[PDB]
Design a protein around this ligand. Structure first.
Ligand code: HEM
Length: 121
């Protein structure tokens, strides 16, 4: 396995402004290459709030996500999002539910990588 840190910023639909969703993901992220796949690995803060999350490439096909750890006490979740070299921008569609404030909303954002996903060894 080969891995390296990658900077990213979740941005509002239709804007380069920082999205509220960015505030619920740890920075930096990670790109991992393994047998023969690439993953953007990221940590969701307050994972209990993320009722649904889907990711898409710029050409609008859904990217497979997997759960690498689920940490119930810290309320975090580490996930892998299948990516390819060259990917610059992911579209995300999320369903966020915060029961204690009667909050139930759905959103679209775009997750912007600082540099395109690199080719790795
Ligand atoms: C108790 C926790 C939270 C509170 C109090 C809260 C509050 C808000 C508020 C006030 C807005 C403004 C809506 C608008 O201007 O139309 C908003 C929108 C939004 N929220 Fe949250 N939110 C919370 C949790 C989350 C979580 C966990 C996520 C996902 C990681 C999230 C992602 C978004 C997104 C994507 C928008 C639409 C505009 C944007 O991209 O920033 N929020 N929320």
């Amino acid at each position: 396995a080969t891995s390296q840190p990658i900077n990213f910023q979740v941005q509002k639909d239709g804007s380069s402004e920082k999205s509220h969703m960015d505030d619920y993901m740890q920075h930096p992220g990670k790109v991992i290459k393994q047998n023969n796949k690439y993953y953007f690995q990221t940590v969701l803060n307050n994972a209990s709030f993320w009722k649904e999350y889907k990711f898409y490439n710029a050409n609008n096909q859904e990217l497979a996500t997997t759960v690498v750890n689920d940490n119930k006490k810290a309320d975090t979740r580490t996930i892998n999002v299948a990516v390819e070299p060259g990917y610059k921008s992911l579209t995300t569609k999320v369903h966020i539910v915060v029961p204690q404030i009667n909050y139930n909303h759905r959103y679209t954002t775009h997750l912007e990588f600082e540099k395109a996903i690199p080719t790795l060894a």
